[PDB]
Amino acid sequence: LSGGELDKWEKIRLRPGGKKQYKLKHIVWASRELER
Amino acid sequence: ADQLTEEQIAEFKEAFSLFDKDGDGTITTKELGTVMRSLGQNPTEAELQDMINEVDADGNGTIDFPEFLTMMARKMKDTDSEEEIREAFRVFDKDGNGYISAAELRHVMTNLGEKLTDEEVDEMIREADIDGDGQVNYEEFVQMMTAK
Ligand SMILES: [Ca+2]
Ligand SMILES: [Ca+2]
Ligand SMILES: [Ca+2]
Ligand SMILES: [Ca+2]
């Protein structure tokens, strides 16, 4: 609003909200090629 | 309703067996790293442990039956801010070195329209620089993006 401390970093964090994605689940998609 | 039945689970349960070669009931780095190979994904030793660690709720170092299922279930909701951390990092990573410095950071702030100099950026890097290495690493970038 007026001033204070370094509030720049918070500007890079942006607002809460985004897409969902796991660090492994995606692999499952690659299974679509491999036979069952 | 918002729930899962034997019909929906019957499908997911089939996925586990696909990754489970020895069919021991738990997916390990040896069994995982193998499947990923045929898929065309050769991650690093540290990366592999990371992927499994995520789903690792009981902290055993392997993907259990429900551990693999719950993973696909999470897709419903929750767990999203994390993506913004990885995406943003890549969006700022020009040299693609996987590290952010005062030179790169200063360039990112410019795109936003914030007049900042080298002396100013120093205050930023100093904040993210937890280990005091002189730069901002992913580990620090994730904490700064997840925290306030
Ligand atoms: Ca196994
Ligand atoms: Ca586990
Ligand atoms: Ca970089
Ligand atoms: Ca650092």
Q: Which domain holds residue A18?
A: 1-36
Residue B40 CB partners (closer than 8 Å, separation 6+): A30
Looking up tokens 């690093």 gives: B44
Residues B71 and B84 in one domain: no
Amino acid letter for position A10: E
Q: Which domain holds residue B44?
A: 1-77
Q: Which of B79, B86, B77 is nearest to B145 (CA)?
A: B86
Those of residues 21-50 in B touching chain A at CB distance below 8 A are 35-36, 38-41, 50
Question: How many Cα atoms are found within 13 Å in the side-chain-facing hemisphere of B97?
Answer: 8
Residues B102 and B122 in one domain: yes
Say how many domains are in chain B: 2
B93 annotated to a ligand binding site = yes
Structure tokens at B98: 């996987």
**Cβ B118 vs Cβ B106: under 8 Å:** yes
**Cβ B23 vs Cβ B17: under 8 Å:** yes
Domain boundary among B41, B57, B77: B77
Backbone φ and ψ of B131, nearest 5°: -75, -10
